[PDB]
Amino acid sequence: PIVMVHQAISPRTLNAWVKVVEEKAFSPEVIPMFSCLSEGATPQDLNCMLNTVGGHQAAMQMLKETINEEAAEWDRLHPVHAGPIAPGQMREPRGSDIAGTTSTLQEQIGWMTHNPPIPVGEIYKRWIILGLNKIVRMYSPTSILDIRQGPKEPFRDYVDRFYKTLRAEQTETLLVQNANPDCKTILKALGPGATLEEMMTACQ
Amino acid sequence: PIVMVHQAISPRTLNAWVKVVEEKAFSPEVIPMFSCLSEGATPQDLNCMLNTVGGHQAAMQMLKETINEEAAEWDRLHPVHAGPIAPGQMREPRGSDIAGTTSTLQEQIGWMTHNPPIPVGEIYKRWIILGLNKIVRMYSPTSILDIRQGPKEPFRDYVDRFYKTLRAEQTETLLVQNANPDCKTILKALGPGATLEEMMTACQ
Amino acid sequence: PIVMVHQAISPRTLNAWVKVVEEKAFSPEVIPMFSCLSEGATPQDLNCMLNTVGGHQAAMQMLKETINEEAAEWDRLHPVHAGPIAPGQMREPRGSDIAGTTSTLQEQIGWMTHNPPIPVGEIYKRWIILGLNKIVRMYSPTSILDIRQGPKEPFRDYVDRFYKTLRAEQTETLLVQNANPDCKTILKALGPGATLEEMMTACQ
Amino acid sequence: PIVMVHQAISPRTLNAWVKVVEEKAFSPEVIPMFSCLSEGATPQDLNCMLNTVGGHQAAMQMLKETINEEAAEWDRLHPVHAGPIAPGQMREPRGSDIAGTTSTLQEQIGWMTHNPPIPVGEIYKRWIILGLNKIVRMYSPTSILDIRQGPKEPFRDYVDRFYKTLRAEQTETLLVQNANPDCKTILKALGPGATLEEMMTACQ
Amino acid sequence: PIVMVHQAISPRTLNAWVKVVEEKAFSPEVIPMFSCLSEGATPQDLNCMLNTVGGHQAAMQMLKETINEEAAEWDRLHPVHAGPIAPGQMREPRGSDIAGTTSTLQEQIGWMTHNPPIPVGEIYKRWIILGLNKIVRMYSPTSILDIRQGPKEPFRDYVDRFYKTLRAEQTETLLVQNANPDCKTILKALGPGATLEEMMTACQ
Amino acid sequence: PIVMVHQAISPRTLNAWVKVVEEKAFSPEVIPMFSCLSEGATPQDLNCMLNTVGGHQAAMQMLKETINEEAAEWDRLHPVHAGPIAPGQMREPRGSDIAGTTSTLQEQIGWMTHNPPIPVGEIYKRWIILGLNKIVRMYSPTSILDIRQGPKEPFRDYVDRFYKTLRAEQTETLLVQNANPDCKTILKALGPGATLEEMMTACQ
């Protein structure tokens, strides 16, 4: 990462990420973890994070596909002049450079710490997150329509499932509709505009 | 966090927080842990802490609601001038900026390290803690009225339960009332103004 | 802590303390651990240490009581001038300021790093330790009078129990008296002034 | 590593690598881990990484063989002048120097931090990775031709196996061919040019 | 420790020591560990190490006794002038100051970083090690005279026990004498002056 | 270690080493680990590493013997002038000084950071490694002559055992000779000059 000087990604960071993906798979909270562990990361750093994941290769291939789509759109909006670059001068990044596949770390650092910056790390991270969001939505096991409160399920546990699902598929009305009959009666009686807090206290 | 320069949240910090919320849920001591792990945090840092929590999504939604209430009150007391901001100058933060949803890290650092500072990290942390306090009180399993000393419960174990409950629901009189008959006799005989220490030694 | 600049308490430190209190409860060695983990700590730091403890709330309440007693005595000996403080100047700390309940971290740092210093961290730590000492003595399970060497207990194991107890309740004569008959005979025969080393070798 | 000054490889780094090779053997993701843990490494550092591996000595011998092949090719393209080197001057590296077997750390640092640099760490790392790639391909247990979707295997689990295999042996057409009859029917009906995402949603 | 500036003992260091004493008790290697973990330590640091040990209070009392003996001898050889010390000047350390019981950390740092230094940390560490050596010898379970090679004990395992014992009680002749009859025959036949290496190869 | 300033050996480093020797004993990879963990170490540092090992005291005694042999040879080649050394000047190291038994850390640092340096850490490390190599060879359980491929042993597993053994005892011809009849037939048919890679692919 660039913290301005460059510092190698730490083994602690790498290991934390790889373990999260191992334990959580693609639960929604994995995206914030990725974003939080990669602050100021270069494209090379980001590729270390993705490439050290051993499992989930279907997902990782989908991710490459999304990245390639964004890289091709980058090339469309920002064509680079073909031909020998000015001796000693910073060149223009193309999509594959931003994605760190055809750029060196030295070049990435140069872009990222230039004045003004070409924020290749930040641009790449956006493409990755776009791809991760698709994966999170795909691996969500259950439709929000199928999250319904059980006959003996505490309201809080139901609300946990409801919002966990909503977060993945990435409301209060459906929330009341999908509640069991005893809670629904209480909830409807609350009237319009009840906060979640008021609903949860009511069905406690 | 801002320690003045900015430093990325550490994986150790993130992991510690996420594990606390996993193991303790919303026991009262989680609030001091949050406050202790987020010293000098920016709004982006604080959002990393909240967003990496995978479970308890009912609570996390309640928390968003409280934050939105405080953000709307911030907007009421401190309206921001609409229109193109002065070239190169620091803009005024609105509620969503303080909450880090419509502000960049660069802007947060600028506010927080300005002279004088606009302490957006400290303002946001107060809103979060206000929200966490409501959650702690909601998830408290038992009324202080129902914490009563068992027939064969050591006084110390009862006092532990009593003050643990009190802390969550966020005294000595109720304490004596809820004691068992053998201890209550001893306690009443102590007279008024006994310290906890004296009561505990008496019923040992 | 102040190490002169301020640095946030580390998660490692916090976690170490919380685990010690979990595993050891209030065994005597917990006090030196507290003192060793909080070197140069501000009142805010010290409160993080105490407040993140989840259990033992009877003890933690006793501790608050002792702190309040010391704070009231501080106020007695060092009254603070009431009224608007001199613009831009350092104010006098009262008891609740030293205890970090009515003071900000900024003020604590100012006091602690002033010339000469008002050592609020060191003053508060003394009050806490005074309170912890009372708790250690209260939670000591057994009277030194009841630590007696078993018929088949090795002398070393008995001496371990004897001094562990003594440390908590916070000698050689009682030590010999409480020894079993076979060791007592050997010990008495040693004569006066024997070192612990000589006694232990004799009963080996 | 060189981070410009030299810093010893960290025990954390060493331990992380040795554990990866223990747990993952030569699964493909081990190569990115190696590359990510050895950023800016000297030849001495790289040799520490390889030499501390206790098992897999067949692989480690194959790796030495590949390194020796690259070192002999280096000598072919870049012969070094034989005879006493200029007093106090930097000498030319031969293959065994780059591989760190006949060079000192001091010399490696000198080459790597010279102007312009002789990037011996980067050159050696390329030879190692070339060797590791051969090993990964050799230890791949199964031909991509034998990765076929089971009758009751979810499409996602099959795609995971397919791309994990492809990565090791280091497509969509074979992917559809090797699918079970129920998914193949759906896939063929999608028409040409379907993304992985579309195929996976279709067979979900 | 003093590394010249002072730095607080680390929780990692403290925890490592306390765990060693827990797991190894007073096996001989504990002394080198103590010495290695306390490099440049002040008396306060050293007291943190000793005082955080929860068990073995017989040993810890013996250790205090030895320290007091050395402190009284220090006072004998280096009496301190009684009376008000020169305003603002460094005072002379007595035994209890070196042992850190009547000296502040500030004073210890002053002594240790003075020109020339009064090396109170190094002097105290010597007294502690003297005390630890006595404890190690006391807790050695078995006489070197009783370490004899079993009928089916491999020579290497016997030699391990022999030198482990010797280290605690703190040779080749006894080594050969205590060997079993089959090895003794081989050893005697080696002649005088055999290295351990030669003996071990012979009885392999 | 000297990194130029001196820094105390880290508890992490110490603990890593002690654990390696516990788990691996004297498997060959322990030597590279020792060398990698002790970069720039002083003689005092190296002695911490050796002395904190609790087990294997036969080996540790053999190691002392080898060190003493090298120290006596050092004294033979580099005699030190006897008599009072020049006030304030650096003295000449003898063997026991290099081995850190009669030298202080201060003197070691002085030698190691002098211009030109007397590299006592590097000289001692060579003696230790010489001693460790003898131990590794002694504790190798099996002759390379006895490493033969089992009737149903995969070729790769056999090659692993063969090179692991070779490394300890510290080839392709013996490799083919010791192979089982089915692989030997294939191997012989490969002709001369086959790489390990080609042999392993052939017998896969």
Swiss-Prot record, chains A, B, C, D, E, F:
Q: Where is this region: Dimerization/Multimerization of capsid protein p24?
A: 139-204
Q: How is it modified after translation?
A: Phosphorylated possibly by host MAPK1; this phosphorylation is necessary for Pin1-mediated virion uncoating.
Q: Where is this region: Interaction with human PPIA/CYPA and NUP153?
A: 51-89
Phosphoserine sites (modified residues): 10
Q: Where is this site: Cis/trans isomerization of proline peptide bond?
A: 83-84
Q: Which domain of life is it from?
A: Viruses
Q: Where in or outside the cell? A: Virion
Report quaternary structure and partners. Answer: Homodimer; the homodimer further multimerizes as homohexamers or homopentamers. Interacts with human PPIA/CYPA; This interaction stabilizes the capsid. Interacts with human NUP153. Interacts with host PDZD8; this interaction stabilizes the capsid. Interacts with monkey TRIM5; this interaction destabilizes the capsid.
Protein purpose = Forms the conical core that encapsulates the genomic RNA-nucleocapsid complex in the virion. Most core are conical, with only 7% tubular. The core is constituted by capsid protein hexamer subunits. The core is disassembled soon after virion entry. Host restriction factors such as TRIM5-alpha or TRIMCyp bind retroviral capsids and cause premature capsid disassembly, leading to blocks in reverse transcription. Capsid restriction by TRIM5 is one of the factors which restricts HIV-1 to the human species. Host PIN1 apparently facilitates the virion uncoating.
This chain belongs to the protein called: Capsid protein p24
Instruction: Tell me the classification of the organism that encodes this protein.
Output: Viruses, Riboviria, Pararnavirae, Artverviricota, Revtraviricetes
Report where the shown chain sits in the full-length sequence: first residue, last residue, total length: 133 to 351 of 1435
